Design a protein around this ligand. Structure first.
Ligand SMILES: [Ca+2]
Lengths: 346, 94
């Protein structure tokens, strides 16, 4: 609950709504820049180093045998610590297309204060999910075997119901659950009768056998449902099995940012309460063996700029620190279009 | 909108005034910025506000009579201002 302003160097413009903040051994990295890969930094990723609250953005080159990736503006990113590597899937390219590749991101050499990523890609077979954004991906382990879950987000109309008077329209994806295998690219979709409507911009917490899909926004009904789920799964040697329960005590939350404060203890910082106005109070979630508890926290003090703004956005840096962003007011006509803050939980 | 001009075109090359197609229509395509458009009276420089349009131009129209192509329309002042029809307008930066 300690708000701190941060200042940005000369390449301030590469921050857009919908970035991605990777974490590698206490170090931070930026992803999802603006435009295309430039002449200066050919890859797109960056060093997000903050010292004395004046950040810089130094580039970071790739390996010899990587696969150069387009900057994805709203992907689903999960921390798969089984080495250490991030998983990117789907997204939204600069041409407003929706890619359908799984991007695996890991370090190959870090020395002389210069890193070298080794981004390779992976394709899915079986029940390939249609390309989308606003969704979330998570990995779970069971019986000594690993498996990745994937819940639906939102996407465009298919190639039949799409005419050019409404070419850029969107519709919520079908609310199945996908089980994806990072070893061989196998995906088998399962339809759940306890799951009714599509969901988008939710928060997903995993503890080793379950995914707590809390919040999320509904487009077809234009409401925010307060039904926190729990997808308790199981992985035998033969066929896998999924299960879900509906629990009480959820909150109407969408596009909030989730980060890790302690061991198995997480925090939720403001997304949107209704579509027009904002969400200010923050929530604390503590996990258990089989229980789930949410709880309010002490509402960290905001600047009057945050209390007067209409939107904001951001991600977490991993060390219990949220990096957010406020659009500067064009009525003052003297702004860099994006003021920033950092949020230390500790 | 250019009805009588295409009829006078095929009269001037001495075809029939009634003739089915197909005409081939060669159409120029162009999109470029428009700089500033701010109408800020005075006070202080409100903001930039750069806009940009998407436009086209019916450059020429040809037809064939069995064997040979013939040019029934040619637009005389190609990069003019009167003949650059607007198609899309947006108040977005280029
Ligand atoms: Ca020009």
């Amino acid at each position: 609950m300690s708000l701190q302003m941060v200042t940005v160097g000369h390449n301030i413009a590469l921050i857009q709504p919908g970035f991605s903040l990777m974490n590698f051994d206490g170090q931070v990295f930026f992803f999802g820049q603006k435009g295309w890969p430039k002449r200066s930094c050919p890859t797109g990723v960056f060093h997000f180093d903050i010292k004395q609250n004046h950040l810089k953005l130094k580039p970071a080159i790739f390996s010899k045998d990587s696969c150069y990736l387009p900057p994805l503006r709203y992907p689903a990113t999960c921390s798969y610590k089984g080495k250490h590597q991030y998983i990117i899937h789907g997204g939204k390219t600069p041409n407003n297309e929706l890619s359908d590749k799984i991007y695996i991101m890991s370090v190959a050499c870090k020395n002389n204060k210069k890193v070298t990523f080794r981004c390779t890609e992976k394709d899915l077979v079986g029940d390939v999910p249609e390309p989308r954004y606003g969704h979330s991906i998570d990995v779970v382990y069971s019986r000594g075997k690993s498996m990745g879950v994937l819940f639906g987000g939102r996407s465009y109309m298919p190639s039949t119901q799409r005419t050019t008077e409404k070419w850029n329209s969107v519709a919520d994806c079908l609310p199945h659950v996908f089980l994806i295998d990072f070893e061989f690219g196998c995906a088998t979709s399962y339809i759940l009768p306890e799951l009714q409507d599509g969901l988008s911009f939710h928060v997903s917490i995993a503890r080793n056998d379950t995914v707590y899909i809390l919040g999320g926004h509904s487009l077809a009904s234009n409401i925010r449902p307060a039904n926190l789920y729990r997808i308790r799964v199981d992985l035998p040697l033969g066929t896998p099995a999924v299960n879900c329960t509906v629990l009480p005590g959820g909150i109407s939350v969408s596009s909030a940012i989730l980060t890790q404060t302690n061991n198995d203890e997480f925090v939720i910082v403001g997304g949107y309460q209704l579509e027009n106005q904002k969400r200010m109070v923050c929530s604390l979630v503590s996990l258990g063996d089989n229980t789930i508890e949410i709880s309010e926290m002490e509402t960290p003090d905001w600047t009057s700029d945050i209390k007067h703004s209409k939107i904001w956005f951001g991600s977490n840096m991993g060390n219990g620190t949220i990096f957010l962003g406020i659009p500067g007011d064009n009525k003052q006509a003297m702004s860099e279009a994006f003021y920033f803050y950092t949020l230390r939980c500790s | 909108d250019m009805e009588e001009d295409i009829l006078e075109g095929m009269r001037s090359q001495d075809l029939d005034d009634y003739l089915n197609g197909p005409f081939t229509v060669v159409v120029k395509e162009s999109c470029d910025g428009m700089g500033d458009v701010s109408e800020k009276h005075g006070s202080g420089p409100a903001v930039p506000e750069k806009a940009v349009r998407f436009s086209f131009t019916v450059m020429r129209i040809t037809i064939e009579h069995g064997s040979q192509n013939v040019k029934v329309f040619e637009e005389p002042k190609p990069n003019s201002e009167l003949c650059c029809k607007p198609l899309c307008l947006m108040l977005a930066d280029e």
